Amino acid sequence: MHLICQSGDVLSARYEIVDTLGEGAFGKVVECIDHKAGGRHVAVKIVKNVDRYCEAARSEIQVLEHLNTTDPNSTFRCVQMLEWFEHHGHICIVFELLGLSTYDFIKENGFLPFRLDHIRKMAYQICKSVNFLHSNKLTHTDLKPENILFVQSDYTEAYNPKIKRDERTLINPDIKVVDFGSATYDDEHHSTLVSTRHYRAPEVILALGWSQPCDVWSIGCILIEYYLGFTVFPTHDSKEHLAMMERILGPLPKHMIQKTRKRKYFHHDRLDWDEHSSAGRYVSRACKPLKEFMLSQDVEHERLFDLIQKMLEYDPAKRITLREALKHPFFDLLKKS
Ligand SMILES: CN1CCN(c2ccc(Nc3nccc(-c4cnn5ncccc45)n3)cc2F)CC1
């Protein structure tokens, strides 16, 4: 992989590598000068030569040709793919250049949460963009802070004596959504497993089928991370996740516990869980009812926490849609002149 990129390398006799932006399971994204587009800077994703990622990359291109044709102005803030190509048998996708991820900024800002007026603007653009997928019979399936990128990443730094550390604040918190490698059409085959551990919806964990709603869950989880600076679901393990869900959101619905073919996770009608074990005590300590995480009782926090609660509905049918989410009172303050 690194054998196929170094600063100075030229790709498709067009793109000159100046910087690695970041790496991942997929491969790496590099910043390039495009010599045949007036020296415009672009991001190029170089995909690991594994069929798994090869397949993912190829569908990502078909989804983005679709989204780009449907929204040529990029009004719904999906990342714009400019073109793609092959370099030593690795698939390469060229995008408009974006800054670092909402995850990166949190991490670099000392794992501090975003301030609320930024969460509102970011939550809206995430909901508008992902709803545009939902309007076009697509589910992203893999929403997480890492896959939400800032257009501009520039920030001011200032010492907050409220928290006794230096705090970084975005100038422009505008975001776009990336990684359509896992995006599935309503008419296409649905994988048994989708989404990253912490942002997996309960319908997905319990193998009850999934669709647009499994995205709304993930967003719910994103907005908590932004509010706190850490996930409220810190775990790799499936059963542990449901146990944390139970402590924060309350008991799983009767019908979902009934219908699930993953009966490994249940003992009659309750989660098969020794609360007095390694994972057990950890959950009792690390989790509490959702509303006990609110840092303020200010009206603006409660209306955010009402949306998060609506997004974390256990039943995907009842679960608020993003068309409704965009109407929620939390966003009234964006629409005031
Ligand atoms: C530890 N962090 C270090 C920073 N990393 C990082 C920062 C900025 C971009 N930029 C960029 N621009 C346009 C498009 C894309 C993009 C398209 N598709 N994808 N897919 C997955 C991830 C990014 C993108 N990325 C890229 C970076 F990797 C992430 C990992």
Author numbering: 147 to 483
How do the authors describe this structure?
In order to provide structural insights into inhibitor binding, we attempted to determine the complex structure of ERK3 and inhibitors. Unfortunately, we did not succeed in obtaining crystals of any complexes, either by co-crystallization or soaking. Therefore, we determined the structure of CAF052 in complex with CDC-like kinase 1 (CLK1), which belongs to the same kinase group (CMGC) as ERK3, and performed structural comparison. In CLK1, CAF052 adopted a typical type-I binding mode, utilizing its 2-aminopyrimidine core for the interactions with the backbone of the hinge residue L244. Structural superimposition demonstrated that although sharing a low-sequent identity the binding mode of the inhibitor, as well as the contacts with the hinge region observed in CLK1, could most likely be maintained in ERK3. Nevertheless, other interactions observed in CLK1 might differ in ERK3 due to amino acid variations. This included the contact between the inhibitor piperazine and the αD D250 in CLK1, which might likely be absent in ERK3 harbouring N117 at this position. In this binding mode, the pyrazolopyridazine group was expected to still bind within the back pocket of ERK3 and form a contact with the β3 catalytic lysine. Nonetheless, other interactions engaged by this moiety were presumably different, due to the substitutions of a F241 gatekeeper and V324 in CLK1 for Q108 and G171, respectively, in ERK3. This structural comparison therefore suggests that ERK3 likely shares similar mechanisms for accommodating inhibitors to that of other kinases, enabling binding of various inhibitors that are developed for protein kinases from diverse families.
Extracellular signal-regulated kinase 3 (ERK3) is a poorly studied member of the mitogen-activated protein kinase (MAPK) family. Similar to ERK4, ERK7, and NLK, ERK3 is classified as an atypical MAPK. Despite potentially important functions in cellular processes and tumorigenesis, no ERK3-selective inhibitors have been published that could be used as tools to elucidate the roles of this kinase in normal and pathological signalling processes. To contribute to recent global research efforts on untargeted human proteins, we present the crystal structure as well as the discovery of inhibitors of ERK3, providing a foundation for the development of selective inhibitors for this poorly-studied, atypical MAPK kinase.
